[PDB]
Symmetry: C3
Subunit: 582 residues, 3 copies
């Protein structure tokens, strides 16, 4: 539910980024009070106690009362502001409505200022992280409304500016707090054994859904950088729990093997370029004690993964001996949105075996409404069984449609935890907003993270993301191209686009873009951080190249690079954006 709501909120903000036209602010605001201040329950205390249970450290009974009391009162005010904001909809002229809405806006904007430190208490920053992050986003949307149509509210140009300036610094402040405190929180649960890793990974996945995916949208509220509609991609991989037992007491981590440090390096893919799974091939082994107690469980797999117009990559995990047949499932261009998995446990004299004898992959074709299940199993009986529904961990956002139209995540990679007499698959997922084609729209600002590329230049490493960008990030230490991406355009192609790239660098440099590997458009831009400085939100600037360009084909490719600086300096690239000039 905690996770369910963070998905609904973050996924619905994706639709209302930059400048919205007409009346999606009010319906979004209306949706927002319904999800955040509902009848019946308090989702804030659900946030607070969700993280508290994760890190296994309860807030003081004090800090509890203070924040939630501040939160509901703020919700009475947020409900009041939107209520009247929902009446300004029809209003064109009134010296009283724009005078009360005036005051309740200003009061609540002010109210969020005082309230923000309340959810930011020393020694209990981490338990309040989701509570804090969801509140921080709320304040940043309201400052966006100052720029949006406060100009009609009865606000002066100077006060709009004063409002925009705090939105800028609050975007920097809120994006830093969440990143560091998500990191510190994650840091403390670093353990020494597997049981601590499950708690570690759980903290990572759940808070990535609520907090980090919201923070990554904060830059896209800026009215001046995104003066129209803009589109964003969240590119991080998240890992659902490994499919193993949990009851009655060996389980799956006390069934021998590996260490915390071993599991973390074995399942977490190092920072890569984003790929979609293609063909999956499962190998099985049979482990019986008699005619009534056997099960052929999951021992190894071979998964093909392709970047966007990439050459095929195939990884191998586990065992591959094929006395038993191997079953192969087909995932290419099909969104595996829901996996129902069964964790089997067979027992010998003292030694129990954990494996997976059944896993169904529900898939949808995002381009043309084709569904399907893909089943793996051989046979089993007399063994223990524990279900793993992916939607327990990765629910579709709450919609008026079924799950195969409303899902929020795809299967992207299957790793495998192996040991002596233990097999625990781990599904890594990628967010829906990260698309398969890098489609470039004609009437909105398309953000394409450089992580959506297919090829790295001979010196470009993908380094792990700071927290507040939505995914990992690419870093050159000397001049040259960064990565090679492929982009697709819609019906009418005559469109000219200017290029703008979110970068972080130690030096003034020349940033360029080449289309179809032939014609080039460059610019000169500024240093954004100090040499030993540790990459915060303000280290990132936008480098707008003046000159517009036409794409030659509906399927063209775009390179991003930066040279003309002395090596040893560090240059980062998060994202190239394409601004349709019109």
């Amino acid at each position: 539910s905690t996770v369910q709501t963070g998905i609904n909120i973050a996924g619905r903000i994706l639709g209302v980024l930059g400048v919205p036209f007409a009346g999606q602010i009010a319906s979004f605001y209306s949706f927002l009070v319904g999800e955040l201040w509902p009848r019946g329950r308090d989702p804030w205390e659900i946030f607070l106690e969700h993280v508290e249970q994760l890190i296994r450290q309860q807030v003081t009974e004090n800090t509890r009362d203070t924040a939630l009391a501040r939160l509901q009162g703020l919700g009475n005010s947020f409900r009041a502001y939107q209520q009247s904001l929902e009446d300004w909809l029809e209003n064109r002229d009134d010296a009283r409505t724009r005078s009360v809405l005036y005051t309740q806006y200003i009061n609540l904007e002010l109210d969020f200022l005082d309230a923000m430190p309340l959810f930011a208490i020393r020694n209990q920053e981490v338990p309040l992280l989701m509570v804090y992050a969801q509140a921080a986003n709320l304040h940043l949307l309201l400052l966006r409304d100052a720029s949006l149509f406060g100009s009609e509210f009865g606000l002066t140009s100077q006060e709009i500016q004063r409002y925009y300036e705090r939105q800028v610094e609050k975007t920097r402040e809120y994006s830093d707090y969440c990143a560091r405190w998500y990191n510190t929180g994650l840091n403390n649960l670093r353990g020494t054994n597997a049981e601590s890793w499950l708690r570690y990974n759980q903290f990572r996945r759940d808070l990535t859904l609520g907090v980090l995916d919201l923070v990554a949208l904060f830059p896209s509220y800026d009215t001046r950088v995104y003066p129209m509609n803009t589109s964003a991609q969240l590119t991080r991989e998240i890992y659902t729990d490994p499919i193993g037992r949990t009851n009655a007491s060996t389980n799956w981590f006390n069934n021998n093997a590996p260490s915390f440090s071993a599991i973390e390096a074995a399942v977490i893919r190092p920072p890569h370029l984003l790929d979609f799974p293609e063909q999956l091939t499962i190998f099985s082994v049979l482990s019986r004690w008699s005619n009534t107690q056997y099960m052929n469980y999951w021992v190894g797999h071979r998964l093909e993964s392709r970047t966007i117009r990439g050459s095929l990559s195939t990884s191998t995990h586990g065992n591959t001996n094929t006395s038993i047949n191997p079953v192969t499932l087909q995932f290419t261009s099909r969104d595996v949105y829901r996996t129902e998995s069964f964790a089997g446990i067979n027992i010998l004299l003292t030694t129990p075996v954990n494996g997976v004898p059944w896993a169904r992959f529900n898939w949808r074709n995002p381009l043309n409404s084709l569904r399907g299940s893909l089943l793996y199993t051989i046979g089993y009986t007399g063994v223990g069984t524990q279900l793993f529904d992916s939607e327990t961990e990765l629910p579709p956002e709450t919609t008026e449609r079924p799950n195969y139209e409303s899902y929020s995540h795809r299967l992207s990679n299957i790793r495998l935890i192996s040991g002596n007499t233990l097999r625990a698959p781990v599904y890594s997922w990628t967010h829906r907003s990260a698309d398969r084609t890098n489609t470039i729209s004609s009437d909105s600002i398309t953000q394409i993270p450089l992580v959506k590329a297919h090829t790295l230049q001979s010196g470009t490493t993908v380094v792990k993301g700071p927290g507040f960008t939505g995914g990992d990030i690419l870093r050159r230490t000397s001049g040259g191209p960064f990565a090679f991406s492929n982009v697709n355009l819609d019906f009418n192609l005559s469109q000219r686009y200017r290029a703008r790239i979110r970068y972080a660098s130690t030096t003034n440099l020349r940033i360029y873009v080449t289309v179809a590997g032939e014609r080039i458009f460059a610019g000169q831009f500024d240093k954004t951080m100090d040499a030993g400085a540790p990459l915060t939100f303000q280290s990132f600037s936008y480098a707008t190249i003046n000159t517009a360009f036409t794409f030659p084909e509906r399927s063209s490719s775009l390179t991003v690079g930066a040279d003309t600086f002395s090596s040893g300096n560090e240059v980062y690239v998060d994202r190239f954006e394409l601004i349709p000039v019109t």
Copy 2:
């Protein structure tokens, strides 16, 4: 003092219900800051520590600081708002006064929103109940001012509505919280012995004075339901402490007898129709040890009680043997407002006897300024003595007049706690606002609770009140009349009145009224709750019958009924109101 203030506040709100004309809001508001934010002391912490001592459970030193700090700051703001509200009195046109008063109104209305959860902390809801309830009333009066003359403030029709809507839902929210939490609080002090019953009853009486009597006036703030002046009656019975010893260690509850469960069923009258005492007859027994240590104490009484135009009822308690003479006092139509009682204790070898050898009943005639004492005693000497002044528990409201003009309660019933060698009278009182004649005014809305009736139909039970109505309530389970009341009208009788009755029902039904048991005016009205649902504030609606009527005599009688529904459903009636049409 805690109790003294709850009386002053609640009693003074009685005069300013519905729509006030001219300038009683400001003087009431001025009175309100004087009583709530005085110089010298903090009555909020007096509230808080009064309940804390009752339930014998102190708030955390934390929750203490938070709420009182919020409260005084709110009082600095409430003092500021009223200060300028007290200057708008003279103002007719000003774009600045109605612009500051504008802002400090809106700010404080908003301020109460955030503040309300502060006085509503989990695990300490009951100790803050009076603190909470008095604050809740404060917020609800200000929302009433939005409807009242915010229309002149510079408020638009839509924002007045938005203000009225929160007044509606806050009236529902605040009336539910107080009722349930008064009930939960009362529930925990349910004990097993008599010493726990005194603490139990003390909690009941004191919090009924401050909280419940205030909540019962919350419906009467609605500007649309009561668009003029309206009159309200509080009909509950409250029970002062039984007159027994308290020092040096047997006292009156360790002098043997009964249990908690025994006392509660023996003294608390089950839900009845309200009656006023008539003739009281005391019986006494003499208990001496010698010539220097005797006392004839109170052993039994016989009290006559009449409903409004009711047949005489006489109850009997205790002993009645009349070797000693019996003394009879006359209370008919006389408001016993003050009782000074003496708890006597005589001692034998080990067995002590508790009784009352002296009790004076100060009375006033509410129609024509006749006072008087009525004394009971026989003779006593050498025995212990402990005074019981009713005004210690039931003080008159703070006025510029003496107690026999400013009293807030009347004696209504005398029960008696009996045991082996123990006599402890208990005085039950009814609030002043509940009148003796059910007078119906020509220019205000007269609320007559159905508990002010004289006769029940053959299936109507008086069930115990939910908490937020002011008294108990009447319930039919099949169609027919509810109860039979008698009403009185003032000088000019030509007036036509329409009837409107606060009801709660499971089904659509026909609600009617008949005047003088002859002519009938009915209507059809809506279901208001679900079958198993537990009767909250929103279960109660108003059923307005369209047709006006003339009363035939200055002393007429009015029946309330509801038929045309299937039995097994439940129908409740709290109150019939009479709206003078003009």
Copy 3:
């Protein structure tokens, strides 16, 4: 730093008292957010933990979170208000800027009301004293801005008055809280030995710098009493730590002697009239153990001190035998702003000796830019050494100039703690704002405390200050003159001035002033307190004598007196002010 900031703030308010013209409010406000809400650190928690360490009693981890969270949010709002206040600078006409600035002013003024009890928690009033006092001043400056130019904001005359009234009562409320709680705090650290006295004196000096010097400026915010520029003097003496050891464990207080009660009476000058040091003569004694371990340390001194046009006074402390030579330093009319002192420790078999073998007095001439050091030493080697820089305790205010132009305090008196084999000088200092000439300006209101006089009448005692005036105070118990002062005027002398004197009295009386001991101007004024009442902020009123006068000479003398009342009553005088009539 805590002390460093209290100096900067208080010293910079001295320049912007009463009514400022043009644009020093905004630059002062800009300075104020920089010093109070800086980047990097939280000076509020530095305040809070500074006092906490002094009294050796930490706030609860709770009260901590609450106040600082309220404080920064208030700082986000204070930064916002000043930000737009810093834009109204250029604005002359706008129905929107004066409408947002409108609302954020009113909101923050309201915000300070609720916030003030937050920093005033029961059982932790003293640790929050500096936090509280600095916040109290902030609120009082904003109320001053209501009177100043709220009249242009869009405020009505009546609301300005309502704003001024709270400024009056808040000036009374904040000045009382700080004085009593500074006193209670100081009271608890009353000890029995010398180690407790150092902690006692430390609490006195540090909180006098931050809190008391700020409170003494609160009266000078009143727009009606000081309708122009006004000048104020802070006249209290503060005492830096006695120069003794602190490491490795005898130190200087365990090296035998005296008690708490002995030290307090020996070093703290009883309430006197303010004097400036003149000629200082140090006597030394030699204490060696061999040729490699000797030191001639400070044993006694003889200091000349003169009031303003006073006869010379000379005090003597310590020893005076002159086998060793005596060194004499010249301080007359020279501001000893910085002293660097060395605490020496020589050791015998078990008995160690503490003395001072080196002390340099940096001085500046305030009239004409002459600097200089004045050194005392004889010779020392092989002994322990611990430096005492006065700016560790008494820093110059943070400026763009060096310390000999920006210092905040002068050396005024040197007392000496003596014992058997122990010498610990103690420097008493007077604040810079207290001047040497009592200069009277032509275009500002000059406050001259009566403590700046030179002669007391035959019945006038200087009694210790209540806390909220800036220094001690003079009290007559029968009619007559109070004290005799000398005043100096600037270039053009034609000016007429009216006299007004801050007094506190039990009776209606005649207060007079005589110039040059010849011509007299008197008036009749009102009782201000009750006979046994204990002198609070409201005990002090201003007695304005109607008639203007001319001073005859550039160096004239002014007497203040009050007769025509019955003896036994008490009459206090803090300050005579001189209002240039024009």
